[PDB]
Design a protein around this motif. Structure first.
Motif, short mmCIF file in Angstrom:
data_model
loop_
_atom_site.label_atom_id
_atom_site.label_comp_id
_atom_site.label_asym_id
_atom_site.label_seq_id
_atom_site.Cartn_x
_atom_site.Cartn_y
_atom_site.Cartn_z
N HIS A 468 0.83 -1.19 0.00
CA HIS A 468 0.00 0.00 0.00
C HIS A 468 0.87 1.25 0.00
CE1 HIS A 468 -3.37 2.63 0.84
NE2 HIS A 468 -2.82 3.02 1.98
N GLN A 469 0.44 2.26 -0.77
CA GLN A 469 1.09 3.58 -0.85
C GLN A 469 2.53 3.50 -1.33
OE1 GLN A 469 0.42 5.31 2.99
NE2 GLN A 469 -1.64 6.03 2.45
N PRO A 474 -4.77 9.35 -5.38
CA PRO A 474 -6.12 9.47 -4.82
C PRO A 474 -6.91 8.16 -4.91
CG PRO A 474 -5.62 11.40 -6.10
CD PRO A 474 -4.48 10.45 -6.32
N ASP A 475 -7.92 8.06 -4.05
CA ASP A 475 -8.52 6.76 -3.74
C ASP A 475 -9.41 6.27 -4.88
OD1 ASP A 475 -9.23 4.48 -2.38
OD2 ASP A 475 -10.33 5.50 -0.79
N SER A 476 -10.14 7.17 -5.54
CA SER A 476 -11.04 6.76 -6.61
C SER A 476 -10.26 6.32 -7.84
CB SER A 476 -11.99 7.90 -6.97
OG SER A 476 -12.85 8.19 -5.89
N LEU A 478 -7.74 4.38 -7.83
CA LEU A 478 -7.66 2.93 -7.70
C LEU A 478 -8.87 2.25 -8.32
CD1 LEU A 478 -6.15 4.08 -4.89
CD2 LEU A 478 -6.24 1.67 -4.26
N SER A 479 -10.06 2.79 -8.07
CA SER A 479 -11.28 2.23 -8.62
C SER A 479 -11.44 2.52 -10.10
CB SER A 479 -12.49 2.78 -7.87
OG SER A 479 -12.62 4.18 -8.08
N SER A 553 -7.03 -4.77 -0.87
CA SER A 553 -8.21 -3.91 -0.97
C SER A 553 -8.09 -3.12 -2.27
CB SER A 553 -8.30 -2.98 0.24
OG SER A 553 -8.55 -3.70 1.44
N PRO A 554 -9.21 -2.58 -2.81
CA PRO A 554 -10.64 -2.68 -2.48
C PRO A 554 -11.40 -3.67 -3.35
CG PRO A 554 -10.31 -0.83 -3.91
CD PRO A 554 -8.94 -1.44 -3.71
#
Ligand SMILES: Nc1ncnc2c1ncn2[C@@H]1O[C@H](COP(=O)(O)OP(=O)(O)O)[C@@H](O)[C@H]1O
Lengths: 596, 687
Positions: A468-469, A474-476, A478-479, A553-554
């Motif tokens: 991780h990292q 930014p988190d989205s 990833l999605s 994750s995620p």
DNA sequence: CATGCATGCATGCATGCATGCATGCATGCATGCATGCATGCATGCATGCATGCATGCATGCA
DNA sequence: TGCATGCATGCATGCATGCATGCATGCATGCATGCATGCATGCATGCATGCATGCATGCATG
């Protein structure tokens, strides 16, 4: 009555037009189709122009005189050959223009060096389409009704552009009160009209020198040739360089020039426009039908795309599948469901990261390499028009706008600022771009496929600290991305051996067969999901939520949407119409290597 | 704008084939026209005559021996104007040029063209020296010289002329081809569609103009650049030109100032006339028109007025319209250019050939009894009057003359009068005499006044001359005169002025001329009211004084005694006229007049000389006449006085009688015939 | 002795101003071209003079 | 006394002579028009001053 000269150019070319019967069946198919085009429109319920491609081949092996006369003074041989051709159209069963296709090393010069030489000749010019003007129709034939006599009339108007010969100009005023004093009431509809367009062509930047001021000329189009080009392409233009106008000798330089009698040919760039003009013979597709009857061709196509790169087996498999693009099913009065696939890779440098990128560019079609910043007009159009014809606002199509139905190559993804990353959420998910500035709020469509490449934050620390990292993104985002490939720096000797003889033999089935097999599968191979496709992935996706969360994750439902796309693109490769369980067996394995 | 038309007429191979026919002809020692061209190169002839028959003979010849010839008769027949110079420049290809050393007294034209031949070559010899001296097979080296030097044109130094000639029907009778150019066509038959063709017309030469030179090209001396400027004029009028038009005076500040020159220019013989319609094919209520014909070059001074001639030529318009307001926009006034003269009634004193002439003349001579055969042949269509026809045969001779030198001439002219009325049909012979005889004008009594048959003064057209009358026209010829009794009394005075030869005096308002006339007189008057009263005397039934009768050497009387035996032959005579179209039967063949006049004209060049024994026979015979004439002295049937002019005639007569022997053999039977025609002419009033 | 947070400072880009630069509208000024007329040249109509002819009158003759 | 013949005299049919008439043409005069100049107008384009972002520092933290 014509003289002896005019009929001799006819009968000599009629001798050539009787010599080769290939063009006879061409105009035959023109007439039969348009007859059948009007036949179906006028029997149940109760388009094509007139021009035929003639090469510059056969005239040298038939008449070297008639060869030469065209290439110097075309204003004597073009009218009688067309008159003879309209004779053939009327004899076997309206302008009936031509093409003059053909490569010649005589006058294929740059437009930069064109002026003041070879005037009144036929010149082939290529270059950049820029600042396309507006489409206007042209008035030709006026129709007038007189009230009391109750009859119509007849009146034409001509201009010097079409005729190609300097004829005595006879202007005529638009008629009113003709014979006795009845009012010439105007009519429309039966009055005929033909569209008209003028454009400018800048020369090639790849042919241009390092830095100097570019200079250009203008081209006026004709009826069936209005609006074939958007501004910003590479187009070959073949026509006749004509200078009109009284050059200042009436009462400080006149003699402005132009090129008429034209044919337009858009050509493929490195990173602009269509490359899908590649033909398919029956000999070609029979090889494809012989190819698709096998059981392991996905492996061969996987191993094919690393011509000079060792390893990376499962990475190459997806690069087939992105060019497949998945299936698109827009819902009934709902929204579309996105079908394409977007991948980011990461790894240590000098590990074929930059050895992948242009291979993605050159093999594919309609790709745009986007490097570094993308500020102010890559995802946008910026609407900067100060158009001198009228105060208005138009658009200049940006690269993300321009790369529709294509691939966007993003280089050095981590160096991008957060400003354009706002647009990437808009681009990658809703497949639309809405630009709302104070002039005009807009909305457009762009469903590009995206590959980006970012580095680790610090060092080669790809496995040491934590998974991780290593990116700190930014988190989205990833999605947004579907598969995230991690390339290691494994040090060995057997692996080094496979590196060793590979690069040594480097410095001392095919690609052009491949893109034929690719673009054929787009218009006829979309498949449809079957009952067997449900039962595996329902069992499988529950495992993806219950136990992958104990490792990484995620897990969103958006991940299951990609599970549809992978089995979709795999059925495109086998050109099946149903969807088999084996397609999911391939698709299930693709997540394991990408993540675990 | 300005399209083009192809036509089957070529200029290329026609020029090739016309070179071969101009070279290859052998039939009529070596080549025909090259020997003629060598005779042209002999510098002794100015004309070139081209037929159409040897062309057609060649055109017969090539098809029978070789594959194919281009047609050339009907080719020339259509347009005929471009065939002048395109044919003539092929002549200058081949020429036996130095064939004779030049004569010092040859021609002032000849010394000028010899310069322009030589000045051309010396200028040609200069330029080929400079180019070989500045190098960087020699045909291109020759070709560079060709275009870098101004020269004299080859049109400027010609010295000869060319006239075409129409084909007869005779060879066209053998092989029918385009024989349309040679038909006796009328001015009324000239439709305005025959322009540019080659034609054949005939008529009467009327109002001949004078010959004056026509300027064609003008030379211009520079006097500064030293060139010569040449201006060709094909219009009616023109202008002199500017100060200079040289290439060397050009591109320079100070141009020259020129002036023309006379001796270096080229001129041409020019004269024209008008042709009146033949007055035989004219429709029943029409008036004859006229036509303008221009004549140029060699053929000038060959057309007397008032003749019958076949004119052939090519039919070209002239840019002219009439009044200014009557112009409908494109009005074309035509003319004809003369090419060849063929005259009917071939004029005497103009031949010298005798061989083919005596091919027929000797057969007339060896026919035997020729002199009695002749007067039978002239106008045989009446009965009797053989001695009357015999004297008129002698009137046709005339043809004697003598001047003593620093003195007077004697006129060798015969003046026979005719008296009697009316059933003798004298005018049947009066029209016949002026018809066969060349230069024959038929005249009446009142239709010419005292000013008509003599000259007159009118304003000259395009070229204040004295327009002459019929006796002015009919000099060296015979005037036929009707009804001298009803002339003007002033018109009688002119006739007495002809009995002294060549004298016509004029004392009018501005004219003092005494013009000359070589005429001949035939007169015929009718007697008084009633017919032949012996109670009436000589000069009683005559309306003219005897001084005029003294001027008449020979006089006849036309009796009409109704005699029983004389009628039956005359009745069989006149009825046989309408049975056929020829009178004599099994005893005589008539002489055609064309062969007849040639035997006459050859007899006109004899001049017989008298002898001494015939001198002795005439003197005492005149004492016979002088004695018995002066024993009556009355107004009886015998006439009053005997003139010495009677002896003047009868010496002249037996001189003219010797001319039909063609031998200069003035003999006793020569004079014996002369006395018989005197005593029978007079005093035939006995019955 | 080794990181994280609050604080302060240096600096590049968005844009609503001032100003220079292309089409029509207007007006004063000077060059060139069609054309009717004064002049000259060519042509047809009418009167006096010379006169052959028809007519009236003087004359001698049967 | 009546009649045929010669001589004097008017008539109008052609030549000189006078004049009116019709047609071709080079030149001096008047008028339509292109051209220089400056303007009011309409619209594209450079620029400098203050704010949010990046980095150094003092303080605190463990
Ligand atoms: N597996 C491999 N097989 C062959 N060549 C390789 C391999 N890995 C790296 N290279 C070499 O690495 C170079 C590309 O470096 P790359 O990793 O693409 O750049 P960056 O990491 O800066 O994006 C190429 O010249 C290629 O020769």
């Amino acid at each position: 009555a014509p003289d002896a000269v005019f009929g001799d150019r006819v009968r000599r070319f009629q001798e050539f037009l009787d010599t080769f019967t290939s063009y006879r069946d061409s105009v035959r198919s023109i007439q039969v189709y348009n007859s059948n085009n009007a036949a179906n429109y006028n029997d149940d319920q109760d388009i094509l122009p007139h021009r035929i491609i003639i090469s510059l081949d056969d005239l040298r092996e038939f008449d070297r005189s008639f060869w030469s006369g065209i290439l110097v003074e075309p204003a004597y041989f073009i009218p009688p050959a067309e008159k003879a051709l309209t004779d053939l159209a009327d004899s076997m069963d309206h302008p009936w223009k031509l093409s003059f296709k053909g490569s010649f090393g005589a006058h294929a010069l740059s437009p930069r060096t064109l002026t003041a030489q070879h005037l009144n000749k036929l010149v082939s010019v290529e270059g950049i389409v820029t600042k396309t003007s507006l489409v206007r129709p042209k008035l030709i034939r006026s129709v007038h009704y007189a009230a009391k006599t109750g009859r119509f009339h007849y009146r034409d108007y001509t201009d010097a552009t079409t005729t190609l010969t300097t004829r005595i100009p006879t202007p005529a005023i638009y008629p009113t009160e003709d014979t006795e004093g009845n009012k010439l009431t105007t009519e429309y509809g039966y009055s005929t009209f033909i569209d008209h367009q003028r454009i400018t062509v800048q020369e090639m930047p790849e042919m241009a020198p390092a830095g100097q001021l570019p200079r250009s000329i203008d081209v006026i189009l004709d009826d069936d040739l209005v609006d074939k080009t958007k501004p910003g392409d590479r187009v070959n233009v073949v026509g006749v360089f004509k200078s009109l106008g009284a050059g200042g000798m009436n009462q400080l330089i006149g003699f402005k020039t132009l090129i008429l009698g034209n044919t337009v040919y858009p050509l493929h760039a490195r990173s602009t426009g269509v490359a899908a003009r590649q033909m398919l013979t029956d000999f070609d597709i029979r090889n494809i039908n012989k190819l698709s009857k096998k059981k392991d061709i996905f492996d061969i196509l996987s191993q094919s795309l690393a011509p000079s790169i060792y390893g990376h087996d499962h990475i190459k498999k997806a690069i087939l599948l992105m060019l497949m693009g998945g299936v698109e099913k827009n819902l009934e009065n709902g929204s579309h469901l996105r079908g394409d696939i977007n991948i980011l890779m990461v790894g240590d440098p000098s590990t074929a990261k930059s050895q992948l990128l242009r291979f993605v560019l050159n093999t594919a079609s309609l790709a745009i390499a986007t490097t570094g910043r993308g500020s102010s007009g890559v995802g946008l159009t910026a609407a900067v028009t100060t158009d001198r014809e009228t105060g208005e606002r138009r658009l200049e199509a940006g690269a993300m706008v321009l790369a529709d139905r294509g691939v966007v190559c993003i280089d050095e993804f981590d160096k991008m600022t957060d400003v354009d990353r706002v647009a990437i959420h808009e681009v990658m998910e809703q497949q639309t771009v809405t630009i709302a500035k104070a002039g005009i709020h807009t909305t457009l469509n762009a469903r590009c496929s995206v590959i980006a490449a970012a580095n680790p934050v610090f060092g080669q620390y790809d496995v040491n600290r934590d998974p991780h990292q290593n990116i700190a993104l930014p988190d989205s985002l990833l999605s947004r991305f579907d598969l995230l490939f991690v390339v290691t720096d494994d040090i060995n000797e057997i692996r080094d051996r496979s590196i060793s003889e590979h690069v040594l033999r480097t410095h001392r089935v095919t690609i052009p067969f491949l893109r034929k097999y690719v673009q054929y599968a787009k218009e006829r191979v979309i498949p449809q999901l079957t009952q067997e496709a449900i039962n595996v992935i329902v069992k499988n996706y529950t495992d993806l939520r219950n136990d992958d969360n104990t490792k990484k994750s995620p897990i969103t439902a958006r991940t299951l949407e990609t599970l549809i796309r992978l089995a979709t693109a795999h059925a495109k490769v086998r050109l099946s119409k149903t969807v088999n369980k084996v397609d999911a067996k391939v698709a299930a394995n693709l997540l394991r290597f990408a993540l675990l | 704008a300005l399209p083009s038309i192809q036509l089957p007429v070529d200029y290329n191979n026609l020029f090739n084939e016309i070179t071969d026919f101009l070279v290859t002809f052998k039939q009529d020692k070596g080549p025909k026209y090259m020997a003629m061209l060598q005779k042209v190169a002999n510098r002794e002839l100015n004309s070139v005559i081209i037929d159409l028959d040897d062309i057609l003979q060649y055109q017969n010849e090539k098809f029978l021996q070789g594959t194919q010839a281009d047609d050339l008769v009907s080719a020339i027949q259509q347009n005929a104007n471009h065939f002048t110079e395109l044919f003539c420049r092929a002549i200058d290809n081949n020429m036996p040029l130095p064939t004779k050393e030049i004569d010092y007294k040859d021609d002032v034209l000849d010394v000028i063209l010899n310069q322009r031949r030589l000045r051309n070559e010396r200028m040609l010899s200069d330029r080929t020296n400079e180019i070989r001296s500045e190098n960087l097979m020699n045909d291109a080296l020759r070709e560079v010289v060709e275009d870098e030097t101004e020269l004299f044109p080859p049109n400027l130094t010609r010295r000869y002329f060319l006239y075409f000639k129409p084909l007869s029907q005779n060879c066209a009778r053998r092989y029918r081809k385009k024989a349309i150019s040679s038909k006796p066509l009328s001015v009324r038959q000239i439709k305005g569609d025959f322009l540019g063709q080659l034609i054949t017309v005939r008529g009467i030469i009327t109002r001949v103009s004078d010959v004056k030179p026509a300027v064609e090209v003008i030379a211009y001396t520079c006097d500064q650049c030293g060139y010569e400027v040449f201006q060709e004029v094909n219009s009616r009028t023109f202008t002199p030109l500017s100060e200079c038009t040289s290439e060397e005076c050009s591109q320079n500040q100070t141009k020259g100032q020129l002036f023309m020159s006379t001796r270096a220019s080229k001129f041409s013989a020019f004269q024209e006339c008008k042709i009146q319609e033949l007055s035989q094919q004219v429709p029943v209520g029409h008036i004859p028109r006229s036509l303008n014909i221009h004549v140029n070059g060699t053929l000038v001074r060959s057309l007397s007025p008032g003749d019958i001639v076949d004119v052939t030529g090519i039919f070209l318009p002239a840019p002219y319209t009439g009044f200014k307001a009557l112009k409908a926009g494109l009005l074309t006034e035509t003319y004809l250019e003369a090419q060849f003269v063929r005259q009917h009634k071939k004029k005497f004193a103009s031949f010298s050939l005798t061989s083919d002439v005596e091919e027929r003349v000797m057969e007339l001579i060896t026919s035997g009894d020729v002199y009695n055969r002749l007067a039978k042949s002239i106008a045989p269509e009446i009965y009797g009057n053989l001695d009357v026809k015999k004297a008129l045969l002698l009137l046709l001779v005339g043809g004697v003359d003598k001047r003593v030198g620093d003195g007077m001439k004697i006129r060798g002219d015969i003046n026979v009068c005719l008296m009697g009325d009316p059933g003798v049909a004298k005018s049947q012979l009066l029209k016949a005499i002026c018809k066969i005889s060349p230069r024959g004008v038929y005249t009446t009594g009142k239709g010419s006044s005292g000013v008509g048959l003599t000259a007159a003064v009118m304003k000259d057209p395009v070229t204040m001359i004295l327009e002459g009358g019929a006796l002015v026209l009919a000099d060296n010829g015979i005037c036929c005169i009707d009804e001298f009794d009803k002339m003007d009394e002033s018109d009688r005075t002119a006739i007495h002025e002809v009995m002294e030869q060549q004298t016509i005096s004029i004392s009018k308002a501005g004219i003092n001329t005494t013009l000359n006339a070589r005429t001949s007189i035939l007169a015929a008057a009718n007697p008084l009211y009633g017919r032949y009263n012996p109670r009436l005397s000589p000069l009683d039934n005559i309306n003219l004084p005897a001084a005029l009768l003294s001027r008449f050497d020979i006089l006849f009387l036309m009796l009409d005694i109704p005699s029983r035996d004389d009628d039956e032959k005359l009745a069989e005579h006149v009825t046989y006229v309408h049975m056929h179209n020829k009178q004599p039967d099994l005893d005589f063949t008539p002489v055609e007049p064309s062969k007849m006049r040639e035997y006459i004209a050859y007899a006109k060049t004899k001049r017989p000389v008298m002898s001494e024994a015939v001198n002795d026979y005439v003197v005492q015979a005149y004492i016979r006449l002088r004695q018995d004439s002066k024993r009556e002295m009355d107004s009886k049937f015998s006439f009053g006085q005997a003139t010495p002019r009677t002896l003047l005639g009868i010496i002249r007569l037996s001189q003219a009688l010797a001319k039909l022997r063609l031998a200069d053999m003035v003999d006793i039977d020569d004079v014996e015939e002369a006395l018989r025609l005197v005593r029978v002419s007079k005093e035939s009033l006995y019955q």
